[PDB]
Amino acid sequence: AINNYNPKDFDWNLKNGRVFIIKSYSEDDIHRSIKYSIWCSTEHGNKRLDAAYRSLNGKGPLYLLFSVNGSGHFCGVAEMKSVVDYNAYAGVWSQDKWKGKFEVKWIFVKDVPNNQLRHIRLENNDNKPVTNSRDTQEVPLEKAKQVLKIIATFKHTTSIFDD
Numbered sequence: 686a687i688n689n690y691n692p693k694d695f696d697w698n699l700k701n702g703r704v705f706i707i708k709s710y711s712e713d714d715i716h717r718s719i720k721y722s723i724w725c726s727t728e729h730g731n732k733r734l735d736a737a738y739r740s741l742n743g744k745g746p747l748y749l750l751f752s753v754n755g756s757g758h759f760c761g762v763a764e765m766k767s768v769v770d771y772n773a774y775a776g777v778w779s780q781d782k783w784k785g786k787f788e789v790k791w792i793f794v795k796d797v798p799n800n801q802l803r804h805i806r807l808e809n810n811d812n813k814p815v816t817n818s819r820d821t822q823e824v825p826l827e828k829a830k831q832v833l834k835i836i837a838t839f840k841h842t843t844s845i846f847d848d
Contacts, residue, residue, distance in 0.1 A: 686719075686846050690761070690794040695837050697830070702745030703737050704829035708820035709753045715760060715845050724749070724763070724789050730821040731785035735769035737823070738787075749789065750824070750832065758798040760845045762836055763789035795841040805831050 707726065709715050718724050726734060738747050747765040752758065767788035776782035799816040805828055806812050815824060815832055824832060 690791060692792070692837075695792070697748075697833055698746055699748075699826070699830055699833065700745065701741075702747060702826075703741060704748045704750065704824040704826075704832070705734060705737070706815075706818040706820065706822040706824065707749045707751045708818075709751060709760075712753055712845060712848050715751065715753060716848070718763070718789060719791050719794060719845075722766075722788055722790065723786050724765075725784065725786045726821055728785065731769045731771075731787070733821050734765060734787070735785070738765055738768060748792075748829070748833070750836070758796045759802070759836065760796055761791060761794040762833070763791045766790050793836055794844055794846065795836070795839065796843040796845070797836050797839045797841065801835055801839060802832060805835075 707724065725731065734747070741747055749763045749765060751760050751763065753760060765787060769785040769787045771783045771785050773783070775784060803814045803816050805815045807815055807818065807822070807824060807828060809825055810818065810822060815828060818824070
């Protein structure tokens with residue numbers, strides 16, 4: 686890998702976009718996402734993000750703030766880059782038939798610890814800290830701006846690449 690990620694004077698274009706938490710079950714899913722520029726949330730996760738992406742059209746960016754369950758930190762930020770693709774061939778049984786995947790462009794890959802963000806609280810999630818969020822929890826715009834500044838400017842000592 687390279688430091689192709691973590692741009693410096695990164696303007697977010699976050700005047701009209703949306704921001705969502707991703708909780709990855711595994712570090713492997715993070716690696717594969719970075720390698721192949723895709724993500725799959727749960728069925729409801731994909732549908733929630735698909736609807737948010739389509740409602741935005743091209744008016745604003747949809748960012749995803751990633752964190753592996755139990756890590757204590759966020760591990761980076763990607764932008765969602767396609768509608769959700771439900772493929773029409775995978776699956777034999779009816780429940781594991783139409784599984785969704787969508788495109789992401791990874792922007793920041795860096796460990797930002799939660800102690801840097803616990804002060805930011807989500808008014809749309811019972812005023813809990815942004816670090817308490819569950820997968821596909823949406824972050825209100827002004828709180829998102831605060832989280833993106835912290836993530837973009839934090840001088841990190843680790844990243845998921847050490848794995």
